[PDB]
Amino acid sequence: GADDDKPIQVNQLPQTAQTFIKTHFPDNKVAMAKMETDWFDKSYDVIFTNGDKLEFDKKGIWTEVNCKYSAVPVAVVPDAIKKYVATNYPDAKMLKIERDKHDYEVKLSNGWEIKFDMQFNVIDIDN
Numbered sequence: 001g002a003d004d005d006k007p008i009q010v011n012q013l014p015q016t017a018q019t020f021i022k023t024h025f026p027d028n029k030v031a032m033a034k035m036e037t038d039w040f041d042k043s044y045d046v047i048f049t050n051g052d053k054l055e056f057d058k059k060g061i062w063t064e065v066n067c068k069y070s071a072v073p074v075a076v077v078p079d080a081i082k083k084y085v086a087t088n089y090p091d092a093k094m095l096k097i098e099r100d101k102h103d104y105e106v107k108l109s110n111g112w113e114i115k116f117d118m119q120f121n122v123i124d125i126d127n
């Protein structure tokens, strides 16, 4: 829970999380990394020196890609979401995407926030 976090090195992240960083953020420098706990659920957080932040679940699968200082790399985003954003907000870039096992939440440069379920039905749209 609150304040139970521990600092970690990159080589202590699950393999999948290390590969994700090398694939999508190869030139970023890690500023800090930690492991968090919530009951028996572990999560990992990485912040780069430019301020961009990643969170991963216990298996190193991303739950947050917060690129508010740049943009979310397009290869990270599910096609259905890319397509929806491209049609409906053609000039916006994505600053942040988060997900759990039930939904995705997307935040765009133009202030719009969109929630999709796992089948990509738009649940809520807010500004």
Ligand SMILES: C[As](C)(=O)[O-]
Residues within 6 Å of the ligand: 047, 051, 052, 053, 068
């Ligand atoms: C609090 As920050 C450096 O992840 O915007």
